[PDB]
Scaffold this active site. Structure first.
Site, PDB file in Angstrom:
ATOM      1  N   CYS A  14     -12.658 -53.685 -81.210  1.00 56.04           N
ATOM      2  CA  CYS A  14     -13.271 -55.000 -80.994  1.00 56.04           C
ATOM      3  C   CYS A  14     -14.010 -55.069 -79.658  1.00 56.04           C
ATOM      4  O   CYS A  14     -14.550 -56.120 -79.308  1.00 56.04           O
ATOM      5  CB  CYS A  14     -12.204 -56.104 -81.067  1.00 56.04           C
ATOM      6  SG  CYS A  14     -11.220 -56.287 -79.547  1.00 56.04           S
ATOM      7  N   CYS A  17     -10.840 -53.575 -75.350  1.00 54.43           N
ATOM      8  CA  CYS A  17     -10.305 -52.616 -74.385  1.00 54.43           C
ATOM      9  C   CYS A  17     -11.351 -52.349 -73.296  1.00 54.43           C
ATOM     10  O   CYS A  17     -11.024 -52.301 -72.101  1.00 54.43           O
ATOM     11  CB  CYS A  17      -9.882 -51.324 -75.101  1.00 54.43           C
ATOM     12  SG  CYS A  17      -8.428 -51.502 -76.188  1.00 54.43           S
ATOM     13  N   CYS A 122      -4.910 -50.271 -81.130  1.00 49.27           N
ATOM     14  CA  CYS A 122      -5.618 -49.750 -82.319  1.00 49.27           C
ATOM     15  C   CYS A 122      -5.649 -48.218 -82.344  1.00 49.27           C
ATOM     16  O   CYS A 122      -5.210 -47.576 -83.315  1.00 49.27           O
ATOM     17  CB  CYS A 122      -7.064 -50.245 -82.394  1.00 49.27           C
ATOM     18  SG  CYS A 122      -7.216 -52.016 -82.684  1.00 49.27           S
ATOM     19  N   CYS A 160      -3.142 -54.883 -76.421  1.00 47.21           N
ATOM     20  CA  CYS A 160      -4.232 -55.457 -77.208  1.00 47.21           C
ATOM     21  C   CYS A 160      -4.802 -56.697 -76.507  1.00 47.21           C
ATOM     22  O   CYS A 160      -4.505 -57.828 -76.887  1.00 47.21           O
ATOM     23  CB  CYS A 160      -3.738 -55.751 -78.635  1.00 47.21           C
ATOM     24  SG  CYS A 160      -5.037 -56.116 -79.830  1.00 47.21           S
ATOM     25  N   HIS A 204      11.641 -58.728 -71.283  1.00 47.97           N
ATOM     26  CA  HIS A 204      12.738 -59.705 -71.221  1.00 47.97           C
ATOM     27  C   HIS A 204      13.685 -59.443 -70.028  1.00 47.97           C
ATOM     28  O   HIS A 204      13.984 -60.364 -69.252  1.00 47.97           O
ATOM     29  CB  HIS A 204      13.441 -59.696 -72.582  1.00 47.97           C
ATOM     30  CG  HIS A 204      14.654 -60.563 -72.673  1.00 47.97           C
ATOM     31  ND1 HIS A 204      14.588 -61.938 -72.801  1.00 47.97           N
ATOM     32  CD2 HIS A 204      15.969 -60.240 -72.734  1.00 47.97           C
ATOM     33  CE1 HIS A 204      15.817 -62.425 -72.900  1.00 47.97           C
ATOM     34  NE2 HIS A 204      16.671 -61.415 -72.862  1.00 47.97           N
ATOM     35  N   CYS A 207      12.065 -60.676 -66.954  1.00 49.65           N
ATOM     36  CA  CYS A 207      11.381 -61.957 -67.092  1.00 49.65           C
ATOM     37  C   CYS A 207      11.925 -63.006 -66.121  1.00 49.65           C
ATOM     38  O   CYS A 207      13.139 -63.140 -65.964  1.00 49.65           O
ATOM     39  CB  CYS A 207      11.538 -62.476 -68.510  1.00 49.65           C
ATOM     40  SG  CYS A 207      10.621 -63.984 -68.809  1.00 49.65           S
ATOM     41  N   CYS A 227      13.135 -71.120 -71.387  1.00 49.09           N
ATOM     42  CA  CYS A 227      12.796 -69.831 -71.975  1.00 49.09           C
ATOM     43  C   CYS A 227      11.992 -70.050 -73.274  1.00 49.09           C
ATOM     44  O   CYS A 227      12.203 -71.037 -73.999  1.00 49.09           O
ATOM     45  CB  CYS A 227      14.093 -69.048 -72.227  1.00 49.09           C
ATOM     46  SG  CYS A 227      13.974 -67.710 -73.431  1.00 49.09           S
ATOM     47  N   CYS A 233       8.828 -65.833 -78.663  1.00 48.65           N
ATOM     48  CA  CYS A 233       8.649 -64.777 -77.654  1.00 48.65           C
ATOM     49  C   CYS A 233       9.216 -63.412 -78.088  1.00 48.65           C
ATOM     50  O   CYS A 233      10.403 -63.313 -78.473  1.00 48.65           O
ATOM     51  CB  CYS A 233       9.240 -65.201 -76.307  1.00 48.65           C
ATOM     52  SG  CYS A 233       8.833 -64.071 -74.978  1.00 48.65           S
ATOM     53  N   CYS A 242       4.147 -56.353 -67.589  1.00 51.85           N
ATOM     54  CA  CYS A 242       3.431 -57.636 -67.455  1.00 51.85           C
ATOM     55  C   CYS A 242       4.151 -58.659 -66.592  1.00 51.85           C
ATOM     56  O   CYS A 242       3.508 -59.426 -65.887  1.00 51.85           O
ATOM     57  CB  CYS A 242       3.169 -58.245 -68.827  1.00 51.85           C
ATOM     58  SG  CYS A 242       2.263 -57.147 -69.914  1.00 51.85           S
ATOM     59  N   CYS A 254       1.158 -63.936 -70.446  1.00 45.41           N
ATOM     60  CA  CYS A 254       1.420 -64.502 -71.762  1.00 45.41           C
ATOM     61  C   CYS A 254       2.671 -65.361 -71.801  1.00 45.41           C
ATOM     62  O   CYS A 254       2.680 -66.419 -72.426  1.00 45.41           O
ATOM     63  CB  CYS A 254       1.497 -63.404 -72.821  1.00 45.41           C
ATOM     64  SG  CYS A 254       0.122 -62.269 -72.711  1.00 45.41           S
ATOM     65  N   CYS A 260       5.090 -63.923 -75.365  1.00 53.53           N
ATOM     66  CA  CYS A 260       4.731 -62.521 -75.568  1.00 53.53           C
ATOM     67  C   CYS A 260       4.642 -62.265 -77.079  1.00 53.53           C
ATOM     68  O   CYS A 260       5.515 -62.692 -77.848  1.00 53.53           O
ATOM     69  CB  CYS A 260       5.783 -61.593 -74.932  1.00 53.53           C
ATOM     70  SG  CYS A 260       5.452 -59.809 -75.192  1.00 53.53           S
ATOM     71  N   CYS A 263       2.241 -56.957 -77.818  1.00 51.84           N
ATOM     72  CA  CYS A 263       0.957 -56.337 -78.150  1.00 51.84           C
ATOM     73  C   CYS A 263       0.868 -54.836 -77.840  1.00 51.84           C
ATOM     74  O   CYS A 263       0.014 -54.161 -78.388  1.00 51.84           O
ATOM     75  CB  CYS A 263      -0.202 -57.113 -77.497  1.00 51.84           C
ATOM     76  SG  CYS A 263      -0.440 -56.740 -75.725  1.00 51.84           S
TER      77      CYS A 263
HETATM   78  S1  SF4 Z   1      10.612 -66.169 -72.103  1.00 49.87           S
HETATM   79 FE1  SF4 Z   1      10.653 -64.376 -73.568  1.00 49.87          FE
HETATM   80  S2  SF4 Z   1      10.906 -62.519 -72.235  1.00 49.87           S
HETATM   81 FE2  SF4 Z   1      11.383 -64.367 -70.931  1.00 49.87          FE
HETATM   82  S3  SF4 Z   1      13.638 -64.672 -70.985  1.00 49.87           S
HETATM   83 FE3  SF4 Z   1      12.779 -65.916 -72.680  1.00 49.87          FE
HETATM   84  S4  SF4 Z   1      12.665 -64.580 -74.569  1.00 49.87           S
HETATM   85 FE4  SF4 Z   1      13.010 -63.280 -72.703  1.00 49.87          FE
HETATM   86  S1  SF4 Z   2      -6.438 -52.601 -79.014  1.00 54.21           S
HETATM   87 FE1  SF4 Z   2      -6.875 -54.842 -79.349  1.00 54.21          FE
HETATM   88  S2  SF4 Z   2      -8.356 -55.262 -77.679  1.00 54.21           S
HETATM   89 FE2  SF4 Z   2      -8.402 -52.955 -77.962  1.00 54.21          FE
HETATM   90  S3  SF4 Z   2      -9.970 -52.469 -79.607  1.00 54.21           S
HETATM   91 FE3  SF4 Z   2      -7.985 -52.853 -80.700  1.00 54.21          FE
HETATM   92  S4  SF4 Z   2      -8.092 -55.075 -81.305  1.00 54.21           S
HETATM   93 FE4  SF4 Z   2      -9.540 -54.766 -79.618  1.00 54.21          FE
HETATM   94  S1  SF4 Z   3       1.616 -59.960 -75.412  1.00 55.68           S
HETATM   95 FE1  SF4 Z   3       3.469 -59.258 -74.185  1.00 55.68          FE
HETATM   96  S2  SF4 Z   3       3.081 -57.046 -73.875  1.00 55.68           S
HETATM   97 FE2  SF4 Z   3       1.080 -57.928 -74.503  1.00 55.68          FE
HETATM   98  S3  SF4 Z   3       0.084 -58.422 -72.516  1.00 55.68           S
HETATM   99 FE3  SF4 Z   3       1.164 -60.302 -73.161  1.00 55.68          FE
HETATM  100  S4  SF4 Z   3       3.200 -60.199 -72.094  1.00 55.68           S
HETATM  101 FE4  SF4 Z   3       2.269 -58.120 -71.985  1.00 55.68          FE
END
Ligand code: SF4
Ligand code: SF4
Ligand code: SF4
Ligand code: FCO
Ligand SMILES: [Ca+2]
Ligand SMILES: [Ca+2]
Ligand SMILES: [Ca+2]
Ligand code: NI
Ligand SMILES: [S]
Lengths: 279, 489
Positions: A14, A17, A122, A160, A204, A207, A227, A233, A242, A254, A260, A263
């Site tokens: 897409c 990246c 991907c 992603c 987690h 977090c 949370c 999540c 992250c 995220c 989250c 991804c």
């Molecule tokens: S927000 Fe998501 S990663 Fe953070 S403590 Fe809660 S479930 Fe875990």
């Molecule tokens: S990994 Fe996600 S951001 Fe990267 S080319 Fe694939 S769909 Fe797009």
């Molecule tokens: S979806 Fe989860 S693993 Fe992906 S960038 Fe966001 S916090 Fe990080």
């Protein structure tokens, strides 16, 4: 002194990246392009087009044989003899035209590379194009290499999109290794071929909402305190840094913003879905 | 005396594009546009929790994911029967508006400008066409050529940081970018705080300064050197717009209004009159005559005789129509930026107050770039206003439940043009999901009646005095800012 030669190819991608890479800081993209890598071929930003672009790509792959990084963005579709992804056309010495499929391109370039780096979920794992319902026989780089019996050093940088720090960090670590392998060993990879440097931490466990999770303080909706577990999540099953690094130069991430969605994981998206139902 | 030129990959667009032209007597006389990559999001989406669609659809494109997210959450809002709050509407506009700025800047500089500006002598700026008709070639006064080229190249380099700052702005309330987390059915997931509104505003003022002081002046200067490029790349001169950035809670008023302009006449946009043909596309339809998107079908067939593209062919009242900044700016006909009014007078001797005052010049290679720059300024004015309207602390999210059976459509304009997502739900799952995207309207192949798509048609008449350096072909194509990920999905 010398920059890392890069040939960046796109399959069922897409361009996200690439766009995420453009968001790099310390170094920023200008310094990456002028000082860190020689971006020899990249369909989104390069000056040349068509025959000239492809001829340049193949010239670099020959001149820098065994000495360039093949960067792959997007999945490799194998159904219908590869015809769900045509990456260019080559004009032989008689005037006849021949289309090049993503399968053909990767089969050609991977053995010429020093290493292949699959950037994004991907290319690394199949991701959304390889998800349930697809009819393109969409495949990851690792699975295509296995099917093709291609033995080439492969490092996966999923997400992603991936955070630019993960892509830049991995490429710089790889290049440093090539320049001095005993001073700079290759980053240790997990069982899914991604660097523990970036993908060793569980979201987690690291977090900032973990105290709330432990006290059963769960956000009733997105805009309530607590949370995010009940909102869907996937931090508990996701391994990336992250929580420490955050996104877009530390602006947000995220989990603070929403949830989250896992991804970076090899089972994204199907194993992380539905996104707004708890794990 | 015809010569065929085939360009695959046509680079510095998003995604996989092939352009074929026939040239005779120094001009393009025929053209074919082909999208060569397919993923099938409409198939992948089937059977899922409908709420997942606003994450899945963003992966159609990492350049414009906020547009797809917007269309998807609006389709969901419609299907789920939930009304977004004032602050939710404004927050969604701030998330999306920041990427409009990013996308237009990315396009002009990092996709389009290397057809005009000579970069440094290192990859990826070289190799390039030997006779590329660049600023350094066109401007005969060498000092002026060097100074103007350096001026453009420094803006290209500075724009790398400006577009990155735009993504900080998107992430402010969107979570991250590419691929936001902050827009969902029912509104937005994070209520703006006074501190974060101020942090968005501070970044925005830097972007806005670049737009007004650098980008607009470069575009008008560029057009004053390439006056010939306001006189070619014409096409059908039919445009359509759906409305974008709703300015009130009932979605009756927009920053840029919906409308159609066909064969010299304005009309209202009626979504019932959109249909897609597949006569020259790699798809099977269960019935002849083209299909309205509400009964759209995605049955890929790369073996279909006579087909040449994975892009379907959308038509409005059986007419090809183009989309994008030119379309929106033509339909709305807003007042031009103060910079544009001034430089049109100073550099061209043109008196112009409103976009339509450009007349025929709007429908050209340079007209499309001008429209995009002007729209960037217009969007910045709007963002500046929204930053005053947004209320720290005010609820942005309203709860909803997945319906058993429903339909919804989200209409918006992606940076590249008109966008809708159609969602049909059965047994609380996605039964059908149909996407009619921006570049789909521009880069489509011939329909069943042989009518060329807008880019195909706009290529007719483009000058190619040097077949080995056919620079105007790519210049035309890139003026449309095509995204083939979006076109095909
Ligand atoms: S927000 Fe998501 S990663 Fe953070 S403590 Fe809660 S479930 Fe875990
Ligand atoms: S990994 Fe996600 S951001 Fe990267 S080319 Fe694939 S769909 Fe797009
Ligand atoms: S979806 Fe989860 S693993 Fe992906 S960038 Fe966001 S916090 Fe990080
Ligand atoms: N802008 C944008 Fe992407 C395209 N074409 C979408 O929708
Ligand atoms: Ca083999
Ligand atoms: Ca074929
Ligand atoms: Ca579609
Ligand atoms: Ni796009
Ligand atoms: S967007």
């Amino acid at each position: 002194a010398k920059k890392a030669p890069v040939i960046w190819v796109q399959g069922q991608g897409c361009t996200g990246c690439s766009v995420s890479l453009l968001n790099a800081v310390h170094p920023r993209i200008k310094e990456i392009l002028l000082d860190v890598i020689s971006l020899e071929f990249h369909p989104t930003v390069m000056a040349s087009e068509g025959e000239m672009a492809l001829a340049h790509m193949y010239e670099i792959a020959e001149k820098f044989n065994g000495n360039f990084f093949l960067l792959v963005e997007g999945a490799i579709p194998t159904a219908k003899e590869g015809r769900y992804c045509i990456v260019g056309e080559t004009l032989d010495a008689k005037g006849h035209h021949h289309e090049v499929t993503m399968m053909e391109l990767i089969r050609d370039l991977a053995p010429k590379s020093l290493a292949t780096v699959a950037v994004g979920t991907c290319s690394a794992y199949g991701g959304i194009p390889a998800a349930e319902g697809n009819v393109t026989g969409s495949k990851s780089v690792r699975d295509f290499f296995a099917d093709e019996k291609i033995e080439k050093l492969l490092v996966n940088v999923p997400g992603c999109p991936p955070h630019p720090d993960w892509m830049v960090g991995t490429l710089v670590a790889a290049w440093s290794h090539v320049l001095n392998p005993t001073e700079h060993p290759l980053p240790e990879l997990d069982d899914d071929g991604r660097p523990l440097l970036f993908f060793g931490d569980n979201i987690h466990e690291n977090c900032p909402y973990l105290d709330k999770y432990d006290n059963s303080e769960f956000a009733e909706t997105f805009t309530k305190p607590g949370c995010k577990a009940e909102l869907g999540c996937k931090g508990p099953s996701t391994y990336a840094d992250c929580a420490k690094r955050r996104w877009n130069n530390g602006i947000n991430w995220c989990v603070e913003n929403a949830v989250c969605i896992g991804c970076v994981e090899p089972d994204f998206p199907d194993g992380k879905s539905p996104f707004y139902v708890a794990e | 005396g015809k010569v065929k030129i085939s360009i695959d990959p046509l680079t510095r667009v998003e995604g996989h594009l092939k352009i074929e032209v026939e040239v005779k007597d120094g001009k393009v006389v025929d053209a074919k546009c082909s999208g060569g990559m397919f993923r099938g999001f409409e198939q992948i989406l089937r059977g899922r929790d409908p709420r997942d669609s606003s994450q899945i659809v963003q992966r159609i494109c990492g350049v414009c994911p906020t547009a797809h997210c917007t269309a998807s959450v609006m389709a969901q809002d419609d299907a789920f029967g939930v009304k977004v709050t004032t602050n939710g509407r404004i927050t969604r506009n701030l998330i999306f508006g920041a990427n409009y700025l990013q996308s237009h800047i990315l396009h002009f500089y990092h996709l389009a400008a290397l057809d005009y500006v000579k970069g440094p002598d290192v990859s990826p700026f070289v190799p390039r066409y030997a006779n590329a008709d660049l600023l350094t070639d066109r401007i005969k006064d060498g000092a002026k050529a060097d100074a103007t080229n350096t001026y453009g190249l420094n803006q290209y380099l500075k724009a790398l940081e400006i577009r990155r700052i735009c993504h900080e702005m998107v992430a402010m309330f969107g979570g991250r970018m590419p691929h936001v987390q902050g827009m969902v059915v029912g509104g937005a997931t994070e209520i703006p705080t006074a501190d974060k509104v101020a942090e968005y505003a501070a970044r925005f003022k830097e972007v806005q300064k670049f737009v007004i002081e650098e980008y607009l002046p470069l575009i008008y200067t560029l057009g004053s050197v390439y006056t010939d490029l306001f006189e070619t790349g014409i096409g059908w001169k039919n445009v359509i717009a759906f409305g974008v950035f709703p300015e009130d809670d009932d979605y009756k008023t927009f920053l840029l209004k919906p409308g159609v302009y066909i064969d010299g006449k304005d009309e209202e946009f009626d979504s019932k009159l959109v249909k897609e043909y597949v006569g020259h596309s790699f798809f099977d339809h269960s019935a002849p005559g083209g299909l309205h998107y509400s009964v759209g079908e995605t049955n890929p067939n790369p073996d279909k005789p006579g087909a040449y593209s994975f892009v379907k062919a959308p038509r409005y009242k059986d007419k090809p129509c183009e989309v994008g900044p030119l379309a929106r700016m033509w339909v709305q006909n807003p007042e031009l930026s103060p910079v544009g009014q001034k430089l049109l007078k100073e550099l061209y001797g043109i008196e112009a107050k409103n976009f339509r005052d450009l007349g025929d010049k709007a429908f050209s290679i340079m007209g499309r770039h001008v429209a995009r720059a002007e729209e960037t300024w217009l969007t910045a004015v709007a963002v500046e206003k929204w930053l005053k309207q947004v209320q720290p602390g005010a609820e942005t999210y309203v709860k909803s439940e997945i319906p058993d059976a429903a339909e919804g459509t989200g209409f918006t304009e992606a940076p590249r043009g008109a966008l809708l997502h159609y969602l049909k739900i059965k047994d609380k799952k996605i039964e059908n999901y149909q996407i009619v995207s921006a570049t789909l309207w521009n880069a489509n192949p011939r329909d069943d009646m042989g009518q060329r798509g807008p880019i195909e048609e706009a290529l007719i008449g483009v000058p190619v005095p040097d077949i080995k350096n056919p620079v105007n072909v790519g210049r035309l194509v890139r003026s449309y800012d095509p995204x083939l990920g979006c076109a095909v999905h």
